[PDB]
Write an enzyme that holds these catalytic residues in place. Structure first.
Site, PDB file in Angstrom:
ATOM      1  N   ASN A  36      -0.093  11.620   1.286  1.00 52.68           N
ATOM      2  CA  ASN A  36       0.495  10.593   2.171  1.00 52.68           C
ATOM      3  C   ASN A  36       0.711  11.122   3.569  1.00 52.68           C
ATOM      4  OD1 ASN A  36       0.540   9.134  -0.361  1.00 52.68           O
ATOM      5  ND2 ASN A  36       2.737   9.399  -0.542  1.00 52.68           N
TER       6      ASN A  36
ATOM      7  N   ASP B 272       7.903   9.161   0.560  1.00 54.11           N
ATOM      8  CA  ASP B 272       6.990   9.913  -0.281  1.00 54.11           C
ATOM      9  C   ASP B 272       6.094  10.726   0.629  1.00 54.11           C
ATOM     10  OD1 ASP B 272       5.292  10.949  -2.225  1.00 54.11           O
ATOM     11  OD2 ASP B 272       4.976   8.989  -3.222  1.00 54.11           O
TER      12      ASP B 272
END
Ligand SMILES: CCOC(=O)c1[nH]cc2c1NC1=C(C(=O)CCC1)[C@H]2c1cccc(Oc2nc3ccccc3[nH]2)c1
Length: 254
Positions: free
Chosen positions: A135, A130
């Site tokens: 992130n 992800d």
């Protein structure tokens, strides 16, 4: 083996699902790092212990300059401690909100770093990361760090980032990461992901059909790359080495 007394605790960096993260320093080397504190009582009230051991094992095994490093871990009677890399410059998401969109040089550089990290991940049979802006962390020199470990979401994952094969219930492989790279490249240059819509169902149909448009400022080279990455057929998506060799990347990456 490490111990809490081996580190000098600084200011809190954030809040975690199961504890807090602190800026810290290894007493001997005076090295700055992040110390994530996880409460066992909370980890227990969630039955995630076996999951933690797995995530920790993955991270520990991955050693790349563009992947957030887990230096080690230790624990006491009530807490679990993760010795993590400190990314001084924060999340790419935060930078994106501040600037609204990124220039071609910054984007092509970030994509290069991601492609290298992903290519390394793949070589270690680690796929489907992800890599959404939230992130992604930034080192002292503004180098990108994948921090996937630990905005509209299905059981499959982050909606705006799901490839056709996944949403359509079909079979998928590492090519899902190339699709993600195309979505991120677009979001970096534009400020928003390409299939954003009002409903879950609309987004699904948008992805499935690969229905998206480019703002006028997006150049020919960028359009070529994004269009190749966002191919419905996974086999038509370029290889990570082909991303790194793309003329738009070689022209704009620093
Ligand atoms: C800019 C200054 O911050 C840092 O440098 C930095 N470095 C590591 C982290 C962090 N900031 C924060 C973290 C949080 O989790 C909550 C919010 C703040 C944490 C964090 C964030 C993302 C990935 C992480 O990396 C890992 N988190 C884990 C949890 C369980 C098992 C293994 C893990 N590895 C850890």
């Amino acid at each position: 083996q490490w111990a809490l007394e081996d580190f000098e605790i600084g200011r809190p960096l954030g809040k975690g699902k199961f504890g807090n993260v602190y800026l810290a320093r290894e007493k001997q080397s005076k090295f700055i790092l992040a110390l994530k504190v996880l409460f066992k009582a909370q980890l227990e009230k969630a039955g995630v212990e076996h999951q933690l051991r797995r995530e920790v094992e993955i991270q520990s095994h991955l050693r790349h300059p563009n992947i957030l490093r887990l230096y080690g871990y230790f624990h006491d009677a009530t807490r679990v401690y993760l010795i993590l890399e400190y990314a001084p410059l924060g999340t790419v998401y935060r930078e994106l909100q501040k600037l609204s969109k990124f220039d071609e040089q910054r984007t092509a550089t970030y994509i290069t770093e991601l492609a290298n990290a992903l290519s390394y991940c793949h070589s270690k049979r680690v796929i489907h990361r992800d890599i959404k802006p939230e992130n992604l962390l930034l080192g002292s020199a503004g180098e990108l760090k994948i921090a996937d470990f630990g905005r509209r979401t299905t059981l499959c994952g982050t909606l705006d980032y799901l490839p056709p094969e996944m949403i359509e219930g079909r079979m998928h492989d590492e090519k899902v990461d190339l699709w993600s790279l195309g979505v991120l490249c677009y979001e970096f240059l534009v400020g928003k992901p390409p299939f954003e819509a009002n409903t879950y169902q609309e987004t699904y149909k948008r992805i499935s059909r690969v229905e998206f448009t480019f703002p006028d400022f997006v150049t020919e080279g960028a359009r070529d790359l994004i269009s190749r990455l966002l191919k419905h057929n996974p086999s038509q998506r370029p290889m990570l080495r082909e991303v790194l060799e793309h003329p738009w990347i070689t022209a704009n990456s620093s």
